[PDB]
Swiss-Prot record:
The modification Phosphotyrosine is found at residues 192, 196-197, 300. The gene is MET. This is Hepatocyte growth factor receptor. Residues 1-303 are cytoplasmic. Receptor tyrosine kinase that transduces signals from the extracellular matrix into the cytoplasm by binding to hepatocyte growth factor/HGF ligand. Regulates many physiological processes including proliferation, scattering, morphogenesis and survival. Ligand binding at the cell surface induces autophosphorylation of MET on its intracellular domain that provides docking sites for downstream signaling molecules. Following activation by ligand, interacts with the PI3-kinase subunit PIK3R1, PLCG1, SRC, GRB2, STAT3 or the adapter GAB1. (Microbial infection) Acts as a receptor for Listeria monocytogenes internalin InlB, mediating entry of the pathogen into cells. Changing residue 68 to D: In RCCP; constitutive autophosphorylation; causes malignant transformation in cell lines.
């Protein structure tokens, strides 16, 4: 409710930066973008969600060159926990340095309104929408290639002991050189993804054990990766067109028609009932790199 008739809920106010966590603030301060150095084009919305939004922005570097960016914004800055989670969603990238992981250009704090997390524009948007878009004509090799890229990102993130928790094609970005940036929209979650979040959790991407404990690990990320592979080879079909009960009947996602057998064997390993028996992202990189190398771009996958 944006325009309530009356306040009913008690008002917990966070002021009249200092109210935030010191370490978070320090981290945000050293990736600061000056309010005047960023132009946000609020008329040019890239994507809307119920908690946040993403706009086209332009950033001027010190040399005067215009940089095209995406500017993520919080719809409401009255809840301190939401504001903190929002800045954390941006600042976590400051400690990642990998070509298959989304980077942070900076965070613009202005005198009024939402902080603004600035990201490099990703020409082709989210991987799911890209592969679903009929206009594109990816081959099996292209599609496996994207999976390989996601695997490399996750290998790096796993090496840094980072648990993704929401690995899915919708959360991977694709830049102009068709480089896949593992990511997470977080509070800018698109309003049309709500069906995939059932806490609101992404149940169709979640490991058997996470569905029951709601605990997430790198091994549960491996499960999600398998589903992500499935998404790729079906060119973005929704998985499993209660999921715990379904799975526990003894089922897995069916092999997609354009999914090669060795790659399905890999998805099945990613869905091993026992988490500890699931492949590492390192092994997935190895395995998928091999499978990838066998193709030559002659199998075109239909939407
Ligand atoms: C061309 O279209 C788009 C183009 C778009 N280019 C750019 C950005 C976009 O949105 C994002 C995407 C992602 C984030 N991510 C943030 S703030 N944090 C994280 O992703 C943290 C993180 C990092 C690695 C692993 C897990 C978690 C913000 C905004 C874009 C969205 C677009 O359309 C929906
Ligand atoms: Cl191919």
């Amino acid at each position: 409710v944006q325009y309530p008739l009356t306040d009913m809920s008690p008002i917990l106010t966070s002021g009249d930066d200092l109210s935030l966590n010191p370490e978070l603030v320090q981290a945000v301060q050293h990736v600061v973008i000056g309010p005047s150095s960023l132009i946000v084009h609020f008329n040019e919305v890239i994507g809307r969600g119920h908690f946040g939004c993403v706009y086209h922005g332009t950033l001027l570097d010190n040399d005067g060159k215009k940089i095209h960016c995406a500017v993520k914004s919080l719809n409401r800055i009255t809840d301190i926990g939401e504001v903190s989670q929002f800045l954390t969603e941006g600042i976590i990238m400051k400690d990642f340095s990998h070509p298959n992981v989304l980077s942070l250009l900076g965070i613009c704090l202005r005198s009024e309104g939402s902080p603004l997390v600035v990201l490099p524009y990703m020409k082709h948007g989210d991987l799911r929408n890209f592969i679903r878009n009929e206009t594109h004509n990816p081959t099996v090799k292209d599609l496996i290639g994207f999976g390989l890229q996601v695997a490399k990102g996750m290998k790096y993130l796993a090496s840094k002991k980072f648990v993704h928790r929401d690995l899915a094609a919708r959360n991977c970005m694709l830049d102009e050189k068709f480089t896949v940036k593992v990511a997470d929209f977080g509070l800018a979650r698109d309003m049309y993804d709500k069906e995939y979040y059932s806490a609101k959790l992404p149940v169709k991407w979640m490991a058997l054990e996470s569905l029951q404990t709601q605990k997430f690990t790198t091994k549960s990320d491996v499960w999600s990766f398998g589903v992500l592979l499935w998404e790729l080879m079906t060119r973005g079909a929704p998985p499993y067109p209660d999921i715990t009960v379904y799975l526990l009947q003894g089922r897995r996602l069916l092999q997609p028609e354009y999914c090669p057998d060795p790659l399905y064997e890999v998805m099945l390993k990613c869905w091993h009932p026992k988490a500890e028996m699931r492949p590492s992202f390192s092994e997935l990189v190895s395995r998928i790199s091999a499978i990838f190398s066998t193709f030559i771009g002659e199998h075109y996958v239909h939407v």
